[PDB]
């Protein structure tokens, strides 16, 4: 599909199957892309997985997953907020939106036709906070040259 990176480079990537958009110290964003028709280099998103990693005193680990024709307004455990009932540092509102205030991060997910779209707003210091081995992150470095 089309990708707009944190570095404002716009790319058209095939990236078929499961690919990490974000893989950092605070968040995991994983997508599944499918060829629009068999054998096509044009691909589109049928699954969006977001892992909000455990943040002591703010949220327990939460997982969001949307697929084509299934965009819930809750995490996989049926919760709509992280941690306790009083803890609103992490919440979901119906676009379905995820507000991770604790990491100044917003994630918007919607279904446009048969496929899914994604928009992520993240603070620069947190977006660039990742370990050496976390070098595959479509949002940071874009796609491998062979995928474009």
């Amino acid at each position: 599909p089309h990708l707009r990176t944190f570095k404002d480079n716009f790319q058209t990537c095939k990236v078929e199957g499961a690919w990490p958009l974000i893989d950092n110290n605070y968040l995991s964003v994983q997508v599944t892309n499918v060829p629009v028709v068999p054998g096509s280099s044009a691909t589109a998103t049928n699954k969006i997985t977001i892992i909000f990693k455990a943040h002591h005193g703010c949220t327990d680990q939460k997982v969001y997953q949307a697929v084509t024709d299934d965009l819930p307004a809750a995490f996989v455990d049926g919760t709509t907020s992280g941690g306790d009932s009083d803890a609103k540092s992490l919440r979901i509102v119906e676009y379905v939106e995820m507000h991770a205030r604790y990491i100044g991060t917003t994630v918007f997910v919607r279904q446009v036709g048969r496929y899914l779209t994604l928009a992520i707003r993240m603070p620069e210091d947190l977006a660039m906070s990742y370990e050496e081995s976390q070098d595959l992150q479509l949002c940071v470095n874009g796609c491998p040259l062979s995928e474009r």
Binding site: L3, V36, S89, I103, L118, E124
Partner: peptide, 15 residues
């Protein structure tokens, strides 16, 4: 207290 500056944006869409 939990609450986190410049923002970076990422997008993925069709076609």
């Amino acid at each position: 207290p939990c609450n986190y500056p410049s923002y970076l944006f990422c997008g993925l869409f069709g076609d």
